[PDB]
Every structure is written in C-alpha cells, then in structure tokens.
Write a protein that binds this ligand. Structure first.
Ligand SMILES: C[C@H](CCC(=O)NCCS(=O)(=O)O)[C@H]1CC[C@H]2[C@@H]3[C@H](O)C[C@@H]4C[C@H](O)CC[C@]4(C)[C@H]3C[C@H](O)[C@]12C
Length: 180
C-alpha cells in the first residue's frame, strides 16, 4: 500500500532504538491547532509499546518563539499537558491574544491553576532547558523544513497529503512504526 517517495520520505538521521512517533509543532501554527484533535486520536490507537513525543519549534512567534518552546517543555515537566496544550492553542487561535512577553506567558499557566513556585522552578530549570535543546537538535538533524511534521522512528517523514481518510493516515503511521 504505502510507498516511499509517495506516502513518506526517508530522512538522513538514523533509525530510533525503539518505536516512536515524533510530532514537530508550534502553538502559533493554525494547522497544528487543527491537527491537535487528530493527534489525540492517533495516540489512542497507537500499537502497544509505541511512544508518542511532541516537539515544539521556536521559529514562529517572533521574539516569543523560544519562550513558547520553554512553555511547552514546562507542560511536560509539570505533567499538565492535557490541561495546558488545548488552553494555549485556544489562547492563540480562538481568543487571538498571544502572550506579548514572558509575564503574560506565565500568567496563562497561573490562570489555569498552575502553582507559581512550581512553574518558576520548571520554566527556568535544567529539565526544560534540556528538552528545548532536544526539540531543536532533532529538528536540525532531521533536516525538517516546517511544521507540522510527523517523523516515525527518527527516520520516516510522513506525507499526510497522501491519506484519504483519518483511518488511513493512522495505518500509514502504524506501518512506518515497523521499519528500522
Ligand atoms: C488526517 C490527515 C492529516 C491530518 C493533518 O492535519 N495533516 C498534517 C499531518 S502531516 O504533518 O502532514 O503528517 C488529513 C490530511 C488530508 C485529509 C483529507 C483531505 O482533506 C480530503 C478529504 C476532506 C474531507 O472533508 C474529509 C476526508 C478527506 C479525505 C480528508 C481526511 C483527513 O482529514 C486527511 C487524510
């Protein structure tokens, strides 16, 4: 069914050690916003033992892009992705009130009930710094040129504009998870 060059491209990076689906996104990206409920269904139907990893990119949002990457990494660090990922998309794309500075970015978390001391320790901490650097290294090493992008096993770039239903898009990802 699924064919190289048509349904996916092989990237220059080496294959991952264990099965993983990696999404590269930005909270500033409208298509990433549209994609988020689709991602939520992809995750629910992934084969047992396959990991899913969202990676935020810093090149949208002007001088707030890197701060927003740290914000996403903070959602991972604090284990509040289920609450904060839809909140942040909604703030930028429905309310259309993107944060003008880091104070407003922090306030978006506080206004959802995140503890201020826990946010401050995470946002400026080593785990978040390490995760943002990893977002960036993967994006650079993979030769990615934009978002959204979905990479399977560190090496197979999905061409979503090949699927003819949501179920077929899922079949393509699941097939790629079996490649080395
Ligand atoms: C779930 C698919 C991809 C989701 C997405 O947001 N793309 C980005 C992912 S990626 O970075 O390209 O991997 C989308 C992309 C193309 C979509 C199809 C096309 O839009 C064409 C039709 C449109 C109809 O309204 C619904 C069926 C459909 C046949 C769509 C089903 C589904 O929504 C598809 C298959």
């Amino acid at each position: 069914q699924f064919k190289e060059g048509e349904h996916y491209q092989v990237l220059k990076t080496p294959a991952s050690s264990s099965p993983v689906v990696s999404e590269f996104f930005s909270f500033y990206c409208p298509h990433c916003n549209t994609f988020e409920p689709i991602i939520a269904q992809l995750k629910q139907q992934l084969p047992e033992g396959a990991k899913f990893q969202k990676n935020h990119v810093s090149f949208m949002g002007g001088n707030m892009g890197q701060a927003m990457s740290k914000a996403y990494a903070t959602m991972i660090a604090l284990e509040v992705e289920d609450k904060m990922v839809p909140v942040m998309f909604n703030r930028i794309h429905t309310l259309r009130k993107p944060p003008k500075d880091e104070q407003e970015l922090r306030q978006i978390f506080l206004d959802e009930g995140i503890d201020a001391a826990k946010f401050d320790a995470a946002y400026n901490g080593f785990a978040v710094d390490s995760m943002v650097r990893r977002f960036d290294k993967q994006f650079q090493d993979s030769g990615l040129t934009g978002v959204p992008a979905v990479v399977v096993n560190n090496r197979y770039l999905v061409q979503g504009q090949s699927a003819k239903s949501l179920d077929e898009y899922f079949d393509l990802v699941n097939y790629l998870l079996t490649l080395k």
